[PDB]
Design a protein around this ligand. Structure first.
Ligand code: JOV
Ligand code: JOV
Ligand code: JOV
Ligand code: JOV
Ligand code: JOV
Lengths: 348, 348, 348, 348, 348
């Protein structure tokens, strides 16, 4: 017996929707849900979505609170909808998918993913929930995540990290590295070889390799010497050039992190969403060097070094396609006299 | 188990809240409540109140659908709150009272009128509901309506008309004339002898006496002759003077109705609420005669004639207090040489 | 090159979207679209929909301005979406369907109805537009309307009336009676034999037969005598019983229209949408007789007389199913000693 | 000492702003202003403007309540702002001008029209207010209205009618016909000779000449015979042609009024504002004949007959410019073999 | 061809408006602009302005992204409007000026600053844009900024810092120190001798002189001794007195910065805007010492020492006017027995 007052009761008493019985008094004013606590209104939820306030409230309350794949991965894999859960997009403060299956009466297109409406949609299945590996097996389109092996099916080892309540982390007390499976029109797909983005923050950046430790601790010309990166434009691409009005390069999160410790800078996230490649309007506070669209990718420095060293440097300009987070990311490679001039995630 | 979805189920299936079990999907957007009917949103309620949308929706759904006293009467009797019902104010599109008793968890100050919080409030009791005459006897303050006698209680015969779902009518298939009782500080108060306003509309005005039929059919000078009203300023007070820029008199609804048939006019209801005396910014469309505050009362013409003929016409100006709808309405009487010049519901 | 300013230019200069080039300055504030006309804002549209303001504005501007089937018919036929047009629902002030095909970038699920997303949806096709009869033949699900014969397709003759810009009318300068066709799962479905509702208003009701003229002019007992309706409970069903607190019968629009001329009454349309059977919370102003859910159908009196006279009157209570507006409407027939007691569109 | 609570006090006690001292409690919620009346909120104003709610409330309260020129006239004369008053536009429910002079602290550009900011603006002056004729003489740009002669200034006799609180009327108890004066760049401009629109409604249309009485009473062919209008296309232009899907002609309000009595029709006012020529999306309910943009002008039939009979009928198509309400209205005249085919207010 | 969808396309693809062709689907809900990115809504802009949402969105997209003068400077110089650009006020999240010239159709008063409407307004001209030094030369009122010299015109050297996308900085890769020119009624003004505020933050405070380094590193009595500031009330004015309930002095940002490293404190910015002098409701967390209006100015400590040492200390209380950021800032100087008691930016 689903209700606004019951969803609110669960939020107040259980921290989220937990199927518990009970009702608390609720008031809705504009885009905010309130509850009366000893005669005064306490805010429970502020609707930042394009859905009706009470509908967004129920989907947020019914969000998956287990470590789940990051929305960028699900998007890159073509996920349209989730099976009997809500993947909450914490970067957008909104549900990751428009419709639901067996979650909310206003957004449900079906109660079970076996309904014919779900057949053409890529449904997300969670092998950690009972019977979901079998629902994937019976589904025409879908993406499956598991913690262990699946009989017959060959896995694609996903990223080490997952999102737990909006916190991207590599689990120690929980499993965050999943096996990924995908089916298009009833056929189990062979997922491609892929690099993964590291999903780190600019403020809390931690190196994940000896090369990353050396980049953060060494001086620019010491690191380029140690790692034989002469002629690969790391000075421009990774370190950044703040000498002209237009900020040069600075496309790797580790380079932004190194800079951030010394001089702060403004990053305007003009398209706020989870994506493999992020675009920022950057303004360097120390120099006044700036760039309207500065594409940034967080690759492990070793993976970026491997990608750039595996390219033909004899062309003036070409598109270099790299598989990252299961999607095809186009890069722009510009060379001159056999040396790199620039390499950046292609702005389109 | 009260919920928004259950209140909505009742509205859709029963025309109002009827305590039936069930839920329909609801969406709230801004100040409107919608329900999904075959994949599309259908508006159920638009909040015109100062309460939260979902709260106003539940109080409107829980409105008393039996003939009830008109809000002006309840206001004139000092009613603060109703016992276990909602008097919906259709003139304001809002609950007639701020708080409720045993109706809605958001607006309830008490579940029963016997709670000590209700003691200082004048609670409205409906003798047609079981145990409500007893609750009135136990109440410190209150107004009671009944269809018959209550042993020991001296009754006040109320108006012939009552409001049934916003329609003011004199019942033929239902009883609309009630006995009224009031209590202030544990003590039954004797309600005063009173005139009652007729609660008629300008558009559908119907005479309720031979004098009212004669006013609408006869010419000004022959009605004044027939009813011996010479020297009582009916030409100014009732008929209206449209010869000057400021509209003269026109304080009785029957006079406005007679005028309306011949020439239309705009009545700006700048304080839209139910009241014994109504104030309008009137603009006569034929002449351009206008008045910012034109007080209008709908008294039966015979009752108005009786009031004006029961006054001493030897003073230049005095306040004449008349009990109408249980409240004391002050009129302003202006005389000259023993004749009336003007008589109007005195602007406070 | 679709834009808000171009949609607004078309509204201002052509009365609706007409594909004309040009832009006018627009301002959006809350749920209203304004345009600057000589330095002042003029309201162009007020959003009464659950869609974003600018989106609802474009769909309203792109509404079909040719006589189209009434939304009740489309709903009864299972229409989910329209092919390259917008059926505007004037009873709801909103699009009749959630999504569009080739209309607006925000609501489009496809540019053409041939896209695989449209296959499971019942798409509405208009044979008056080029290539739409063919698109219906290629559609898995759909409803087709035509002004003439389609080789091979067995037609269903629809109602005489259609909606032209919110005005329901029987065309004289335009064709409003269409041939209807339906397809479910690639298979043409034979539309059932049906009665049609007349789509008349209470305020401007006009009889459409000698029996309807006789009902409105003759007294209750002489009409029942002339048409041999003795023992069919027309006194209760059609005329209405206003003697008790609960209003008895009154389920045919013609009966409400006859009553309306003599005594006015309030009809609360608590589910405001177009439907074959309408539900109203009725309050009779003369008597105070009322009913929370009074189902009303507008059938031609001859069609209602035919339905009631074609029933077996030997059962106490049974469901009588009648096909009206292509949908199966269940009625409740209550008899006693071979005579009708009541017959009403059964409340679901 | 201007305040929201004082503006509200004036509205409640005087029907509008009257400079009286006092305060009432006010609450603002969304776009509505409320006041507490005996413990409950009563709506005083609903903001339909693009200004902040409290600002629109004060300008509406401070509206000119004397008969003023109709907004179409002021617009046609180039009025940008009013001197120390607010012309309320009742067709738009908004102030007729963006800014004020000596009215409201939020919208004031100046306290007096003598301030240099007002010099390039055409300020409206009211000769009925003390010192305003002098302020016009000192103004660089302006429009002046007077009830009599101004020594030296050559007057323009305006329309008989004016707007008194939204009611357009020809005054009997007040003066509504004004003398008009205009100044552009310090120089008095001679206002042109002009026809005036009659400002009548479709619902309450009243003839203002023997020709207008004859048009409404006589049949089409006998009116055209009596007034020698053969070959002037009155059948198309004035009467309207409802035989084809596109409604033919119907550009004079009297023709729409004659039609309205027999058959009703929908007029969609897609640009709701006061203008000399009005544009409507018309749908005829009887025939289904319709037109997206049907320009309508309310000229006295004699004035229209004079205009059409004063044209050379030897050209196929030409623009005929006529001065109406001080503005130049371009008409489109289409002839064939010396007879009129169509004549309509040319769609810009 | 300006549109909402084109402005949105530019924001998404270029980080701001760049005149690029293209359209993205947009939805407006309340005060937020969204765009569809792979079937989900992504927020592009939240309107914090008093302008319509779509209008504020276009002005924000069309903001000047080059280092521009800080809004306080432009305000102090009397700038009313900018020539063909938008100075975005990042302290208010709104345009710095009401109207625009050649930017947006809704806010434009003119397309070119040469139009007569601009003559009485102080237009801001940017010498870095072609032909703007000549538009200033031809303009009646204006402020001009240049990077280099202007023939004939003597410059006023502005502050070292400018705002680049909301980041106030002293440029190293871009020029931020401009030459200022001003014209009032066609006459090139001689701008006054002025001090400049340093525009530093409380958190990221960096000293800009040996005296400022000494203030932050030395103990109160060591610094006052070294700089011979005995008898100048630096203990009260600069350091702050936190011993009583009312916080004493603390009017210089460097003093707040020194305090902030040791003990944190709440600064309530009750008038959030850019101004030479800032007012804060300060509460010291360590002591509970507080002040409702604590005026703070960020002057270079050497400039403040120079101002205070250039005053006559023989009066009890006088207003000391100092030119800071081209405006006249009144200070209050209180002395006793030839020594300073307090000196603060005068609260009016
Ligand atoms: C405080 C400043 C303006 C210093 O330049 N900005 C930041 O510290 C910062 C860091 C990362 C992202 C974003 Cl948006 C701002
Ligand atoms: C349009 C005019 C001004 C014509 O006189 N007014 C009305 O029709 C009218 C009648 C009764 C009440 C209200 Cl408010 C307006
Ligand atoms: C004001 C009253 C209650 C008078 O009977 N009702 C109406 O005039 C009326 C008529 C038809 C429909 C609706 Cl909703 C109301
Ligand atoms: C309901 C219909 C379509 C019936 O013809 N229209 C009107 O009653 C009507 C009359 C005048 C103006 C407007 Cl907008 C509508
Ligand atoms: C966290 C506290 C409450 C500690 O006192 N405040 C701050 O750190 C702080 C600093 C500067 C300005 C503002 Cl508003 C707050």
């Amino acid at each position: 017996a689903m209700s606004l007052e019951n969803v609110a009761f669960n939020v107040v008493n259980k921290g989220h929707f937990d199927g518990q019985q009970g009702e608390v008094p609720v008031s809705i004013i504009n885009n905010t849900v309130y509850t009366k606590v000893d005669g005064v209104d306490v805010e429970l939820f502020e609707n930042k979505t394009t859905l009706p306030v009470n509908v967004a409230f129920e989907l947020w309350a019914k969000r998956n609170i287990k470590p789940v794949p990051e929305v960028k991965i699900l998007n890159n894999l073509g996920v349209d909808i989730a099976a009997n859960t809500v993947i909450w997009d914490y970067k957008r403060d909104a549900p990751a998918h428009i419709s639901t299956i067996g979650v909310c009466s206003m957004t449900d297109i079906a109660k079970k993913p076996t309904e014919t409406i779900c057949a053409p949609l890529t449904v997300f299945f969670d092998g950690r929930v009972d019977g979901q590996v079998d629902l994937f097996r019976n589904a025409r389109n879908g993406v499956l995540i598991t913690e262990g092996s699946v009989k017959g099916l060959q896995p694609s080892v996903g990223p080490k990290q997952a999102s737990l309540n909006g916190v991207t982390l590599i689990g120690e007390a929980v499993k965050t590295q999943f096996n990924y499976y995908k089916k298009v029109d009833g056929v189990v797909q062979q997922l491609p070889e892929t690099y993964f983005t590291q999903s780190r923050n600019l403020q809390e950046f931690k190196p994940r390799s000896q090369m990353e430790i050396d980049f953060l601790e060494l001086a620019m010309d010491e690191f380029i010497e140690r790692y034989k990166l002469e002629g690969y434009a790391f000075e421009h691409i990774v370190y950044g050039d703040f000498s002209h009005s237009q900020l040069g390069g600075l496309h790797l999160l580790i380079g932004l992190a190194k800079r951030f410790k010394e001089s702060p800078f403004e990053l305007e996230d003009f398209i706020p969403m989870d994506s493999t490649v992020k675009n920022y309007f950057i303004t360097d506070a120390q120099t006044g060097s700036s760039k309207c669209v500065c594409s940034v990718i967080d690759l492990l420095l070793d993976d970026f070094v491997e990608i750039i060293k595996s390219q033909d440097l004899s062309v003036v300009s070409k598109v270099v396609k790299v598989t990252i987070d299961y999607t095809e990311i186009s890069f722009m490679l510009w060379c001159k006299d056999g040396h790199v001039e620039t390499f950046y995630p292609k702005l389109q």
